[PDB]
Amino acid sequence: YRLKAYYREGEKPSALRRAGKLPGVMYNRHLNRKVYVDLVEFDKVFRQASIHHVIVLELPDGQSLPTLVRQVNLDKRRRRPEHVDFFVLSDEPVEMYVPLRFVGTPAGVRAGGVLQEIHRDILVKVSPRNIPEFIEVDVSGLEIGDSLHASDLKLPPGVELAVSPEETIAAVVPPE
Amino acid sequence: MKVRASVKRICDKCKVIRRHGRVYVICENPKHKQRQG
Amino acid sequence: XXXXXXXXXXXXXXXXXXXXXXXXXXXXXXXXXXXXXXXXXXXXXXXXXXXXXXXXXXXXXXXXXXXXXXXXXXXXXXXXXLXXXXXXXXXXXXXXXXXXXXXXXXXXXXXXXXXXXXXXXXXXXXXXXX
């Protein structure tokens, strides 16, 4: 789970992209210095960690910096990333979205059964050092009626996260 | 099926071969003889 | 390259698991001389002295990994592999000596053996047969 970024100096952003590289920016309370990486080298990674794991960098500086996207400007049209951003990880608890993965087979399936996963990630605070990956859900009792949400889930020791707790996390609607 | 502006594969034994300067399609049952037009 | 390590690695725990392993070559054999060459080599054995028409390219390694040789003379074509695990190696090699000499097969359609760890020849498939 590692990337090498090339120090952006401040040379036509258009260039980079219209080059073969993929510009970006890393930072945090202390820092904020324009950077860049290659397009491709990127995706392979993304498509795997995207933003639920932690990307470590190196740069020409043999400096490995632990991070994870705060966002990614996209392209509106002909979709394909534009800019990128990197949050230089500290030891201080931080706002990251835990990847969600529901387990078991839906009750209302034999019967009407088409599961809606509202938001399968989440605004969880925690020491970046200790970041569980996926969070165990359930369906061994999920019906077409309302459906589990908020804090009816497991909070791995150390995880406190910010929800409401309200946001219906998921549910099942009727087929066709 | 024979002459249409949308030639495709209808079944599995169909082969898209081209010739004379047009896409063609042959198969087991003539019931597929396709020919761009 | 997945089950190739599931099949070739399943070809030596039974290669290093015997005391009467042959591997002739069988050609022109119907669907009645095969369930008759093992229905006749498992009554004086049970579920151990099977009729294995194994692999030839999977024998230049299904034999050279647990570390061996003197094998570059016994399966250069469609070769089998008669591995005997239970019952004295004298009822599956006699019940193997008359299962190619009982339907009009020439007594030269086998390729030696490795019956207990000491190479084998062409006058020994007839020797440990009578």
Binding site: I51, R70, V72, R79, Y97, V114, D121, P175, E176 | - | -
Partner: protein
């Protein structure tokens, strides 16, 4: 059919189709999906037009979303009537759609299907379109 229930003006000057999309560009819901490439007006009828075909290809299957919405009033003058003399009344509705505009998206529908679906689903539509799943659609963190 499909249209508001209310309006602040019945008749509305048509306008133009410039670049961008301003919105919707990502997933946010389904398991796979379609995306407009060319800009245009998509008529309600055309919307359900597919809508149906969809649910069709998959009898009692997955759950659909038609992230778009017509609500501009399509204007037509009377057959033959000539120029000037006031604006034709309504005829139907549309939904301006700037490229990269996701339109719908299935879910829980074996890809093979979700896809196949979103293929015909588009055949009703008057412009090319694109099939996708979930990628860089993650605006969480």
């Amino acid at each position: 059919m499909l249209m508001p229930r209310r309006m602040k003006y019945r008749k509305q000057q048509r306008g133009r189709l410039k670049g961008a999309t301003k919105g919707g560009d990502y997933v946010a819901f389904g398991d796979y999906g379609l995306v407009a490439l060319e800009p245009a007006w998509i008529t309600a009828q055309q919307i359900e037009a597919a809508r149906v075909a969809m649910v069709r290809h998959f009898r009692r299957g997955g759950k659909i979303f038609i992230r778009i919405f017509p609500d501009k009033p399509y204007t037509k003058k009377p057959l033959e009537v000539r120029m000037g003399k006031g604006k034709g009344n309504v005829e139907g509705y549309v939904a301006v759609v700037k490229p990269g505009r996701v339109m719908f998206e299935v879910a829980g529908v074996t890809e093979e299907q979700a896809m196949e679906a979103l293929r015909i689903a588009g055949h009703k539509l008057p412009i090319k379109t694109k099939i996708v799943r979930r990628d860089a659609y993650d605006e969480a963190q």
